[PDB]
From a paper:
AMPARs are homo- or heterotetrameric assemblies of the pore-forming subunits GluA1–4. The activation, deactivation, and desensitization of the receptor is controlled by ligand-binding domains (LBDs) which form a self-contained clamshell-like structure within each of the four subunits. Following glutamate binding, closure of the LBD clamshell around the agonist causes separation of the D2 domains, applying tension to linkers between the LBDs and the ion channel which opens the gate.
To test this, we introduced cysteines at sites on the central axis of the D2–D2 dimer interface, cross-linking of which has previously been shown to inhibit channel opening by trapping the receptor in desensitized-like states. We also crystallized isolated cross-linked [name] LBDs in both the apo-like [name]-bound form (G724CZK) and desensitized-like glutamate-bound forms in two different space groups (G724Cglu Forms A and B). As we anticipated, G724CZK demonstrated reduced Pro632 separation (19.2 Å) compared to the antagonist-bound S729C forms, in keeping with the greater constraints on LBD separation imposed by [name]. By contrast, functional cross-linking of a different mutant [name](R) [name]/γ-2—which did not assume a relaxed LBD dimer when crystallized—trapped these receptors in a non-conducting state, indicating that this conformation must be distinct from that of native desensitized AMPARs.
Numbering used by the authors:
A (entry chain H): 4 to 263
B (entry chain A): 3 to 263
Write the structure that this text describes.
């Protein structure tokens, strides 16, 4: 009767403790979602084992083989009982697994060098002295390609033809580009990482407050699982108890390195 | 079993009477964000529906004396409605008795200031007293501060609970009026969605401070075991992913706003 939790290494959601080599079981891991799992299990009454998903992916269906990979696949195919991770609640995923209400709300956001006079996607869209881009693949790029909102379609039209390319191979390449470009590159990215990067040395980037869309991370369970319902009630309870915000403060801001 | 009874609530700009409503019948008497949302949900789920305004004008809570649900939640629980399509907050006590979709709008407690004022953050307010600040004298925003064990909010609560003259107001309109008339010495704490709305209202003298203090959601609600719950949830996700919910926010807040940029 031990519940198999699948999760994914993504700081500060799930991290290896520095001393993980000298620990066993669930004690090897720490982070926002490690704490969330313990609170969920307490409030629902279950024992559990943490596992890192074998392929390191969140979960998508291969168009050509119909096969889910990532944590979604592990749920669909019987390898784990629950996923506790910053796993985006999406239609195609909700067609095959069950999601709790979100424990975190987030969206696409703008990163600038600390000190840059920009304040919105609208600002970016109607000028050209500041370049801006996204990851060369994934949901943020797809959001701009797929979108029918003029401001963002304008940004996409600028991005898809910019020379030299305004796209980067990794989030880290993106952040570095903001840092070296003396205010002439802005990076578009998931908002929790923007905030996380804003709070650590070298303390030279800012998240622009307003987000460009609204998305959530939720706890995932296979369709018809007896757990989905209680787990969902737990997520709502923890939010209202302030626990979800406490953990965000714990893992993002309490050891912040930049004062503000 | 071939007309779906939608319960909702008169709350601007979610549901409103059209100017000429008396010359109209049925669902055409109404307009607004949730009226449009109801039309999209129905089209995507393939049902016909009738808008009805909740008899008691309430969202949903248990009576202190009888423990019986009032508001739209009650109309779902006790069989009077098939679906609630309204800015109904997703909460633990409500989700125990009815089902919610994933949120179609995300929001939180926010700060309102007079347009032109050196304040932003909850943290700033907690560190000073020149600028008084308060909430509605009842409801979820007040309960958030009273309940919070987070230091900055507990500081703000300890300030508000004893501040004299009272920083609490009897109505949303009284709070707004107090911001407008206090020359920057009064900030109001209220739901982010209404703050944004008030910002788009004449005489255009209030501003929403950007970052929120907590995170909630509004969802579509159905009675437990409804056949609709699953389809409605996927319809909500599709509408978010297609950009449709954001277009509706823009329509009823900024297009029909009185202050634009
Ligand atoms: O479920 C999903 N959850 C995700 C959660 C996050 C994070 F922010 F780390 F919490 C991220 N980060 C985006 C920025 O660089 C670091 C990784 C990607 C996610 N992806 C793939 P995407 O949606 O293509 O980005 C998913 O699929
Ligand atoms: O489900 C709920 N949805 C709510 C939606 C709204 C609005 F923003 F108008 F859409 C408001 N407004 C708060 C600001 O002044 C006007 C009314 C209250 C709501 N309440 C009561 P609360 O949570 O105690 O505030 C609920 O219970």
């Amino acid at each position: 009767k031990t519940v198999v939790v699948t999760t994914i290494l993504e700081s500060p959601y799930v991290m290896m403790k520095k001393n993980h080599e000298m620990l066993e079981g669930n004690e090897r891991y720490e982070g926002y979602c490690v704490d969330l799992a313990a609170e969920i299990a307490k409030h629902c009454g279950f024992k559990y084992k943490l596992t890192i998903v074998g392929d390191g992916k969140y979960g998508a269906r291969d168009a050509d083989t119909k096969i889910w990979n990532g944590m979604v696949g592990e749920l669909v195919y019987g390898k784990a009982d629950i996923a506790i991770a910053p796993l985006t609640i999406t239609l195609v995923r909700e067609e095959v697994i069950d999601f709790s209400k979100p424990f975190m709300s987030l969206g696409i956001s703008i990163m600038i060098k600390k000190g840059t006079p920009i304040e919105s996607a609208e600002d970016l869209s109607k000028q050209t002295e500041i370049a801006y881009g996204t990851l060369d693949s994934g949901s943020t790029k797809e959001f701009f390609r797929r979108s029918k909102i003029a401001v963002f379609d304008k940004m996409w039209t600028y991005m898809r033809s910019a020379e030299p390319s305004v796209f980067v191979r990794t989030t880290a390449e993106g952040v570095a580009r903001v840092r070296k470009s003396k205010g002439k590159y802005a990076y578009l990215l998931e908002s929790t990482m923007n905030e996380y990067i804003e709070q650590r040395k070298p303390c030279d980037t800012m998240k622009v407050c307003g987000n460009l869309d609204s998305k959530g991370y939720g706890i995932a369970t296979p369709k018809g699982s007896s757990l989905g319902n209680a787990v969902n009630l737990a997520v709502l309870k923890l939010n209202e108890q302030g626990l979800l915000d406490k953990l965000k403060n714990k893992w993002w801001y309490d050891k912040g390195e930049c004062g503000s």
